[model samples]
Target chain A: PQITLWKRPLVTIRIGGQLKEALLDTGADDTVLEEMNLPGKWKPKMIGGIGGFIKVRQYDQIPVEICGHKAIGTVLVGPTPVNIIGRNLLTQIGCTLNF
Target chain B: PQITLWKRPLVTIRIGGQLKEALLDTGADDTVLEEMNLPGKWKPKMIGGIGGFIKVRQYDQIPVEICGHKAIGTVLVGPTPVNIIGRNLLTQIGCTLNF
Candidate 1:
């Protein structure tokens, strides 16, 4: 049942500075890191979107190696709580579902 | 490229109580609403995750209509500034890209 895209495995991720665990959703098609959860002097970049690009001042990336799995990718900084993993992640690891 | 799942339409959302518009990312897999951006007496629910279900106090759903398109969906209560639409909205509107 978890194999369904609707019910894929939630990848648990740990931010470099944060102690809480974030659910890494393979179902998501974008890379998103929370704003508040992130710390330090890292600055945000200009992100492109439908209406065009907007300058989002946020953490660039951090060390995030998947637990138990040897796969790790950089986090995309965005507003907090909505953090997610997207297609770029799929492109990197080629996400698959095991029923 | 906007049609690509890698870059989908960002439905700008205006929270019921707030005056700011939020970008709704279809690229996101779940219904994530910002915790702080939300107001009132809503509480968190025990949500199941890879690490197991944890009690997360959050908001309830609110009425939200897409900006340009006539499609609208209930905003899932979550942590603030991170509202997003997902497969549920796609299932509802049957989203298509005009290539």
Candidate 2:
């Protein structure tokens, strides 16, 4: 499967039985989402971005669908400015950069 | 050309005759670098990321080489947490998301 990398690289994703928009951020080490409700216990973690650092709730075994590609992985819920799809989940979707 | 989107997706890029490593951030709209001296007049601009917003000096018609792919475009210079290879420069290299 392939997709055009738009100027903003925004994508629709289905996570936790809800549809949401997320940025495909190759720069991010982990997927960070704006605060959301999730079942199960999570570990607190911190991640840094272009501006500063953010604390997050690391939830494992979360299922996420990225443009129809299904993947179950870790999701970080935090006060992120935006929902970000990072390399952790991108790997499961076999994402690549091509010309 | 094709490239693997590694867990971190870090890549070597040459800009302003200097080689540096940058994250291939599809989420970012514009390419941003840590403070660097760039020749020519630049316009002031501000960019917001996961944490907050930061001011930048936008330099146009800058030559940048991404993994040997040559491109000329705008590169933002500022106090970015990390050097980011955004969609602006990625387009010049004809980048896409593939599985």
Candidate 3:
């Protein structure tokens, strides 16, 4: 799928048995979601971006269905302004930027 | 040009008569660059992201050559983690997300 940048490149994702909207952020290095509870133990981590750094719960090997594409990677649960599908998961889903 | 997610999609952009590296961020609503001095007057503004909000200088109609593609849009100058070429300019450059 080729997604035009006329709007934020947001897509539906299935994680933790729930459907949510997430932004396909090529700028972000890691995937950070709005604080949520998931099964399994997570590690305390810090992630930064245009705003600043924030502590998050890092859960590895989390299975996420991104726009119907399945990807397993680290997903950080934190107080993010929005759920972000970063390069970590984008690469797994074979997402690319094109013109 | 098709950019894979194996690494940060950082592209060279020519702005303010200087060449700079910036990320092609589809998640970002507006373009933000690190602190820089531009020839035109700008308005003070605030932008929010996953971490938090920060004050920035918004310069409108700034001419930026994104990977040699011409684009003119509002560019915010601030203390961003990195220079980001957001959706505002990405749309002008005909950038899209493809899988």
Candidate 4:
């Protein structure tokens, strides 16, 4: 499905059985969720953004649903101002930029 | 024109008579350049990102060329880690997200 790119590119996503609003951030390397609960053990990871790097919990083999599209990959959990759906999952949904 | 959404969604843009690489950041409300000399009477402004907010110079009626597409709007100049092509200019270029 195709979606219009809004000012913030906000989308509703389901992760860990919880629905949340996330930004479709193509600039981000990995998907970062605003603080969430995971079932498995995670590793400490750091992600760099426009300002600096922040520590996050990297949970692997996680399933994410965005606008009815399903994707499974590593998900980073941290204290972010916004939840971001990065290219890691966007590629699975065959995302492209159009003009 | 259509472009494949890469991991970083990097695109080449021309502004202030200089060509630079920038990220297609839909999450950002305004376009921001990394320290550019623009010919205009700019006002001090602040933009908030994932990490924090930063001071910037807001230049009005700026012309930006992105991937051969021309756009005119407000451009913010500041000390950003990356140059961002935000929704302000994306809308002028008729940009959309496809999957």
On DockQ, the leading prediction is 3
Query: What lDDT is reached at residue A7 by model 3?
Result: 75
Q: lDDT tens digits, residues B1-99, model 2?
A: 666655567789888788899888888889999999988999999888877788999999999998898889999999888889888888888888887
Q: On a 0 to 1 DockQ scale, where is model 4?
A: 0.67
How do the residues B1-99 of candidate 4 rate in per-residue lDDT, one tens digit apiece? 766655578889999898999998766778988997899799999887766678999999999999999999999989778999988898888888888
Span of ten consecutive residues with least summed lDDT in model 2 chain B: B1-10
lDDT per residue (tens digit) for residues A1-99 in model 2: 665665567789999889999988777778888999988889999887767777899999999999999989999999997899988888888887787
Which 10-residue window in model 1 chain A sums to the lowest lDDT? A1-10
lDDT of 3 by residue, A1-99 (tens): 889988777899999999999999998899999978998999999988777889999999999999899999999999999999999999998999998
Model 4 chain A worst lDDT run, 10 consecutive residues: A1-10
Poorly placed runs, candidate 1 (over 4 Å): A7-9, A17-30, A37-41, A48-54, A57-61, A70-72, A97-99, B1-99
Would candidate 2 be rated incorrect, acceptable, medium or high by CAPRI criteria? medium
Q: List the residue pairs that clash in candidate 3.
A: none
Candidate 3: regions farther than 4 A off: none
lDDT of 3 by residue, B21-71 (tens): 998888889999999888898999999986789999999998999988999
TM agreement with the true structure for every prediction: 0.38, 0.93, 0.98, 0.94
Candidate with maximal TM-score: 3
Report lDDT per candidate.
0.44, 0.86, 0.91, 0.85
Regions of model 4 farther than 4 Å from truth: none
Clash pairs, candidate 2, are: none
Local error of candidate 2 at residue B81 (angstroms): 2.1
Model 3 score (lDDT): 0.91
Which TM-score value belongs to model 2? 0.93
